[PDB]
C-alpha cells in the first residue's frame, strides 16, 4: 500500500495557473484523508471541482472547499453533514500543511486550508491530514490574490481535480 496523492489544477478567472499535488496521510487519519480524496475525485456525485478558494490571507493560509454555498458557510462530508475530529497526531509545522476548517469541536465537513506558514496556535483544534507534495510555487502565486481580511482580488478556482496515486 501507499498514501493517496490528489491534485488540483488551479485557475485565476479561468486562466490556468498550475497543478498542486497533495499527499494524504491515510495511515494516521484514514477517515479524514478518505473524505478529502473522495471529494477530489467527485465519485459520490459532488465535490471540489469548480469551487473556489473564498478566503486567502497572505502569510497565513488559503481556504476553500465550500462547494455548496461558495462563501464559507457551506459544504459537507461524504459521511453525512459533519464528522468528528479523528485525532490530533499531526501539527501545523510549516507551509504546505493541509488542514480541516471547522466551526468548533467535531464539525468537519468539506472545507480545508493550506498553510503558507507555521500556525501552531491551531494545533489541537484543527485536524491536519496532508501536505503539498508538489506545486508549492502555485500556492504562493495564489496567496498574491488574497488580502488582509481574506477577500480575494480575482476568482481562484479548482478548474480540475482528481487522484494521481
Amino acid at each position: 500500500m501507499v498514501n493517496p496523492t490528489v491534485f488540483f489544477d488551479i485557475a485565476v478567472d479561468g486562466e490556468p495557473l498550475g497543478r498542486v499535488s497533495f499527499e494524504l496521510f491515510a495511515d494516521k487519519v484514514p477517515k479524514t484523508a478518505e473524505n478529502f480524496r473522495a471529494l477530489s475525485t467527485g465519485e459520490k456525485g459532488f465535490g471540489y471541482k469548480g469551487s473556489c478558494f473564498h478566503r486567502i490571507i497572505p502569510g497565513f493560509m488559503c481556504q476553500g472547499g465550500d462547494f455548496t454555498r461558495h462563501n464559507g458557510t457551506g459544504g459537507k462530508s461524504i459521511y453525512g453533514e459533519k464528522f468528528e475530529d479523528e485525532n490530533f497526531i499531526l501539527k501545523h509545522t510549516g507551509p504546505g500543511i493541509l488542514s480541516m476548517a471547522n466551526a468548533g469541536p467535531n464539525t468537519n465537513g468539506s472545507q480545508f486550508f493550506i498553510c503558507t506558514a507555521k500556525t501552531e496556535w491551531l494545533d489541537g483544534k484543527h485536524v491536519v491530514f496532508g501536505k503539498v507534495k508538489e506545486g508549492m510555487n502555485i500556492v504562493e502565486a495564489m496567496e498574491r490574490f488574497g488580502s488582509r481580511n481574506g477577500k480575494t482580488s480575482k476568482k481562484i478556482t479548482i478548474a480540475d481535480c482528481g487522484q494521481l496515486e
Binding site: 476548517a101 486550508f113 500556525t119
Partner: peptide
C-alpha cells in the same frame, strides 16, 4: 485573530 472557521468568523 487568525482563525479558519466555517460560518461565524472570529478575531
Amino acid at each position: 485573530v487568525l482563525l479558519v472557521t466555517t460560518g461565524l468568523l472570529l478575531a
